[PDB]
Amino acid sequence: NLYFQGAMVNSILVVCIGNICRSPTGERLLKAALPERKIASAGLKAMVGGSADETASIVANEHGVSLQDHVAQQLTADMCRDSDLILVMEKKHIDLVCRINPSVRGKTMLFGHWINQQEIADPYKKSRDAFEAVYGVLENAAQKWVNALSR
Amino acid sequence: NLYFQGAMVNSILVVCIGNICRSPTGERLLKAALPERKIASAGLKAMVGGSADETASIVANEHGVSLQDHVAQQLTADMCRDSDLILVMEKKHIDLVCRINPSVRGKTMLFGHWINQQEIADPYKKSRDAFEAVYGVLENAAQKWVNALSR
Structure with missing residues (x-):
């Protein structure tokens, strides 16, 4: 059971721009930790209908997370x-x-609220190394959110 | 050694309105944890020259924290x-x-950034119980800031 700011948290929405890179990754990291919660993502100017970015998907898969059947x-x-x-x-x-x-x-709130750096860089169209670095940041940030919401 | 958002933190300023209640308490909780850092407080519309609120001082003293020689x-x-x-x-x-x-x-940032409730209520002119409750919140918030800045 999750709480924040004197209220229950039953649903979490992860938001970025295209809804193909950081946001589906963040969504699926939270879903992996919180199987019974409603977790989704959306874009401020989305590539509506698009699947997750290929490189984002590859990197997530290497760490045991699936971005399959994402629809921006x-x-x-x-x-x-x-x-x-x-x-x-x-x-x-x-x-x-x-x-x-x-x-x-x-x-x-920031996805990175519970990590020292606070903000999380945009890897879209950058190197494989940028996607790997960002994944690790998102993974840490997501775990720290789960800890905060549930302690 | 303290860091936040990709930079060193050498100085911390705690801000509220009068600079006689929550803010000197927060200041002195941080100073107790961080003796070598520059920690101060100020008010958005301060009771310039005032010492710490009497009830705030009593409660802090009970928990081993001094608000002595505070000047708003x-x-x-x-x-x-x-x-x-x-x-x-x-x-x-x-x-x-x-x-x-x-x-x-x-x-x-919020003083309560690292605690679930985020915001910290104003005890000024309220009951002793309000000051005790707020002190405990500030103490927890301050410790969580120290942990975050130093881990």
């Missing part, structure tokens, strides 16, 4: 309202979420 | 620039700090 979707105001916690990769993205739904700033 | 001071833009980390008690206070110095949003 556009973030809507309704998704924001319905989610109990919204996680973004970079600080600038918080304002972007709040433009879609101004009422959710209070529950919009 | 007004937050300035220079203090904001000079501090490596600025900690506020409530989310609404972040924008208030940024009105004094717009360039410091990136290093302005």
